[PDB]
Amino acid sequence: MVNPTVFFDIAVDGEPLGRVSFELFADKVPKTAENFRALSTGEKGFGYKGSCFHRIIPGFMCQGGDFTRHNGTGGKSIYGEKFEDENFILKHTGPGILSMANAGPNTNGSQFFICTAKTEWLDGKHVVFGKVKEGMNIVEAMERFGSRNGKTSKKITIADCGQLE
Numbered sequence: 001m002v003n004p005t006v007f008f009d010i011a012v013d014g015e016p017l018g019r020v021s022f023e024l025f026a027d028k029v030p031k032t033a034e035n036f037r038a039l040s041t042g043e044k045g046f047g048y049k050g051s052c053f054h055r056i057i058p059g060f061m062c063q064g065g066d067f068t069r070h071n072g073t074g075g076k077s078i079y080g081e082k083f084e085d086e087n088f089i090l091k092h093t094g095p096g097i098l099s100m101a102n103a104g105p106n107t108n109g110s111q112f113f114i115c116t117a118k119t120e121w122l123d124g125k126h127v128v129f130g131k132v133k134e135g136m137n138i139v140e141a142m143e144r145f146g147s148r149n150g151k152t153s154k155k156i157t158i159a160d161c162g163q164l165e
């Protein structure tokens, strides 16, 4: 069937910025895609709603997804604290690529990053599972608030999120 579409409504210090939409590559990485989908709807009782982007590096990536500790060290998946690296079929081929952050092999949780460039050296190191479908302009706007070391000058939060059909 068709790949799912989820969206994030982004805010800056509580003020709405816009919506970014993503396609999840469920035909390639079903387990990884399903985790992100369910975390976006909130249907298992926990998820990205209300969490923030803790590390933003202009020209490289925007990372978020820690809804358990809210400091960059937490997050969990719908299957448990960690799940395996499903495969490394997809590559970090350009801006808008959605990939899973990790702390070593087979430690996928909820943290993810959005690529704002093609970065070959990431390949084989992270599982790619989607891409920005619409709202790339919104991702660019979020970048204005990051810095070389990743610390944001303003709170960038996911004010709301879900699935679109």
Ligand SMILES: CC(=O)CC[C@H]1C(=O)N[C@@H](C(C)C)C(=O)N[C@@H](Cc2cccc(O)c2)C(=O)N2CCC[C@H](N2)C(=O)O[C@H](/C(C)=C/CO)C/C=C/C=C/[C@H](O)[C@H](C)[C@H]1O
Pocket (backbone or CB within 6 Å): 055, 057, 060, 061, 063, 072, 073, 074, 100, 101, 102, 103, 111, 113, 122, 125, 148
């Ligand atoms: C439980 C605990 O305390 C662990 C904290 C530790 C960590 O493992 N954080 C994890 C999260 C997911 C739990 C984490 O986040 N992993 C990074 C690891 C990484 C670092 C550098 C390159 C890389 O490919 C992977 C992760 O998956 N991402 C996604 C891709 C970009 C990368 N973070 C990143 O931010 O790269 C920066 C980069 C390459 C900038 C280039 O300009 C350099 C930052 C390093 C941070 C190190 C932390 O002390 C360590 C991750 C800690 O959080």
